[PDB]
Ligand binder design. Structure first.
Ligand SMILES: Cc1cc2nc3c(=O)[nH]c(=O)nc-3n(C[C@H](O)[C@H](O)[C@H](O)COP(=O)(O)OP(=O)(O)OC[C@H]3O[C@@H](n4cnc5c(N)ncnc54)[C@H](O)[C@@H]3O)c2cc1C
Ligand SMILES: Cc1cc2nc3c(=O)[nH]c(=O)nc-3n(C[C@H](O)[C@H](O)[C@H](O)COP(=O)(O)O)c2cc1C
Ligand SMILES: Nc1ncnc2c1ncn2[C@@H]1O[C@H](CO)[C@@H](O)[C@H]1OP(=O)(O)O
Length: 602
């Protein structure tokens, strides 16, 4: 609950703004979009502004009409609503205001693999119209399972024309300030929010004031040499942090130092030059791109993203810094909605997975001002992990189960995951991992006697390591505990069976009523967790139909989770009986009555 700003409508007036793009974002992408769309109003002889719907009172849309040819755009992501867009939502639900005269557009960001695709967008664009506002352009539906960037360049290309036409209008966001005389303790060195907040830890710890927790355990859980699966233990003592199994822990990592050095090396400049990028819109909340003042090196290490494929809007803006014509032209055509330009971007940048440095190496004429480059780079996001311990057993420690990312890219070089390569490097002593916890609704039943069915192959194991530590603990405390079954899976039982001993011990003490593992490569056919579910179908239908058991799914969202959902569709279709459609509805209903929970990630 923060303090609202002044009515945005009034703000727009005082700065001559006629377009306000609102972004609902969780990992920046919706926001990045709203800002791109914002600076876009300029080329079209208009001026706009991005704004966090949380910091404003959306009831003020009703007053927007009072600005000339005013326009409001909504870039909303689904996670329904993201944290910052919750107010708006509850408002869009309670309010009954008459938005007659409001003109809007909406570009939603989602992922098709999800149950409720772009639910937020579909909702916003469909509720504004319910209130009296008129849609100016079609609802954009972004799919991060294909290419969101392309869906966005495709919408934005048909948007602006429809806008300029409708309004009859004819067809460095931040500024740089180098620091010569700066006091040493007044310089951010990587902390996230308040200055020196990292060094002087002061509760309560959240996303803006992360608690640097000490890595007390680092271990490799697998026997092979191909992959590196690891178990870490972060110590949250004196942090005053509460958590339950199912919850997630989030961490702010550090980029690889040499990938950082080499970036200032090729651009031929120093990273230690202390600076600041002050938003040219002196009245805007977001006064800076990241914590300023600070040195390039710091920003490149802690606040910027230097490994993900650059977006089309960044390449276009960097086109002007490449001498050689051929190159300049290539960077320029990366933002096409079709053609050889849309094809080089998807294969040479995306598919190839070339980070910012790579492109600078493969296009040597590109030597941009490191100043305009930092303003273009996206902020470094924190990475989530499903806490792997019960707080009833480890109140003062948060466990993480993860696989390290390192692969060969067509780009020609070996890429490394930012968070994983970093946590990998951290071992118990000087090792501090900046963190905080985010509550989720993946939870053990309210009643201990309620049955539980956990399905989670590979890393999807980790939340369940908690559910089991808790289920077991409840029994020791004399509580009466219903069935507790795990459906895990790995390649081979002597190669990457995670927590084999702990899971054996738990089965032994009777915590785990059933330990069903699936060894995928131990035979000709692939044997996956869903094969076991189909196997134990008769008994699983019993729990579901007569036991009121909860179902859980964790790990790969891409396929594993769909395959398991489909096998649950079949178990019901058979013992219902039912026809796959009535079984789907049955399984989905289980999802709304909170008896089927998902924790899948791509
Ligand atoms: C809510 C949620 C829960 C999660 N829970 C856990 C969990 O508990 N345990 C866990 O291990 N992970 C989990 N993750 C994943 C985790 O957050 C990170 O995505 C993961 O650790 C990699 O992050 P990184 O910074 O190391 O790599 P990044 O720098 O973020 O790179 C990730 C990207 O690299 C690319 N990439 C990965 N491998 C290849 C390849 N071989 N070939 C081509 N592309 C590839 C993909 O674009 C991938 O998205 C979860 C993610 C979310 C969103
Ligand atoms: C935990 C989690 C849950 C998600 N749930 C949904 C969902 O229900 N529907 C959907 O369309 N996309 C869903 N997504 C995908 C995001 O909407 C998509 O990646 C979006 O681009 C993120 O935008 P942001 O960076 O602006 O938050 C989810 C992603 C994560 C990580
Ligand atoms: N589609 C899927 N459904 C269920 N498990 C899968 C899966 N795809 C891969 N797996 C298995 O998930 C486990 C953890 O990664 C591995 O045993 C892997 O086996 P595989 O690698 O032989 O396909």
């Amino acid at each position: 609950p923060p303090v609202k700003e002044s009515s945005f409508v009034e703000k727009m007036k005082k700065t001559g703004r006629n377009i306000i793009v609102f972004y609902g974002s969780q990992t920046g992408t919706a926001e990045e979009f709203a800002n791109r769309l914002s600076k876009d109003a300029h080329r079209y002889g208009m001026r706009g502004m991005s704004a966090d719907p949380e910091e404003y009172d959306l009831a003020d849309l009703s007053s927007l009409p009072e600005i000339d040819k005013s326009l409001v755009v909504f870039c909303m992501a689904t996670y329904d609503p993201t944290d910052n867009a919750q107010d708006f939502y509850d408002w869009l639900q309670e309010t009954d205001v008459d938005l007659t005269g409001v003109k809007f557009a909406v570009f939603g960001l989602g992922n098709k693999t999800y149950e409720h695709f772009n639910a937020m967008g579909k909702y916003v664009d469909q509720r504004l119209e319910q209130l009296g506002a008129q849609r100016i352009f079609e609802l954009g539906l972004g799919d991060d399972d294909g290419n969101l960037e392309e869906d966005f360049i495709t919408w934005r290309e048909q948007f602006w024309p429809a806008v300029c036409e409708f309004f009859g209008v004819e067809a460095r966001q931040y500024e740089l300030v180098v620091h010569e005389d700066m006091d040493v303790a007044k310089v951010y060195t990587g902390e996230m929010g308040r200055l020196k907040s990292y060094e002087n830890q002061k509760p309560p710890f959240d996303a803006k004031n992360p608690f640097l927790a000490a890595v007390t355990a680092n271990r490799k859980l697998n026997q092979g040499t191909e992959r590196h699966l690891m178990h870490l233990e972060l110590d949250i003592s004196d942090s005053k942090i509460r958590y339950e199994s199912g919850d997630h822990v989030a961490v702010y990592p550090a980029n690889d130092s040499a990938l950082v050095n080499q970036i200032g090396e090729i651009l031929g400049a120093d990273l230690d030059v202390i600076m600041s990028l002050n938003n040219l819109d002196e009245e805007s909340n977001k006064k800076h791109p990241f914590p300023c003042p600070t040195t390039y090196r710091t920003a490149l290490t802690y606040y910027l993203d230097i490994t993900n494929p650059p977006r089309t809007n960044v390449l276009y803006e960097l086109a002007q810094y490449a001498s050689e014509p051929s190159e300049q032209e290539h960077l320029h055509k990366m933002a096409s909605s079709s053609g050889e330009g849309k094809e080089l971007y998807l294969s040479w940048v995306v598919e190839a997975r070339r980070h910012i440095l790579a492109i600078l190496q493969d296009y040597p004429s590109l030597r941009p001002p490191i100043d305009h480059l930092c303003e273009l780079l996206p902020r470094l996001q924190a990475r989530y992990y499903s806490i792997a311990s019960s707080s009833k057993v480890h109140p003062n420690s948060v466990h993480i189960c993860a696989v390290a990312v390192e692969y060969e890219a067509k780009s020609g070089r070996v890429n490394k995951g930012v968070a994983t390569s970093w946590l990998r490097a951290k071992e118990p002593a000087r090792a501090l991992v900046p963190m905080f916890v985010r509550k989720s609704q993946f939870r053990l039943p309210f009643k201990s006697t309620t049955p539980v069915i956990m399905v989670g192959p590979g890393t999807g194991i980790a939340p369940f390591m908690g559910f089991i530590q808790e289920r077991a603990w409840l029994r020791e405390q004399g509580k009466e505990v219903g069935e507790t079954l795990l459906y895990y899976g790995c390649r081979r039982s002597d190669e990457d069976y995670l927590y084999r001993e702990e899971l054996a011990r738990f089965h032994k003490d009777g915590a785990l009523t059933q330990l069903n593992v699936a060894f995928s490569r131990e035979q000709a056919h692939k044997v996956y967790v869903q094969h076991l579910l189909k196997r134990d179908r008769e008994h699983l239908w019993k729990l579901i139909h007569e036991g009121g058991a909860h179902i859980y799914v964790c790990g790969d969202a891409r396929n594993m989770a769909k395959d398991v959902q489909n096998t649950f569709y079949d178990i019901v279709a058979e013992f219902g009986p039912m026809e796959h459609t009535q079984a789907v509805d049955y399984v989905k209903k289980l999802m709304t009555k909170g008896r089927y929970s998902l924790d899948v990630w791509s």
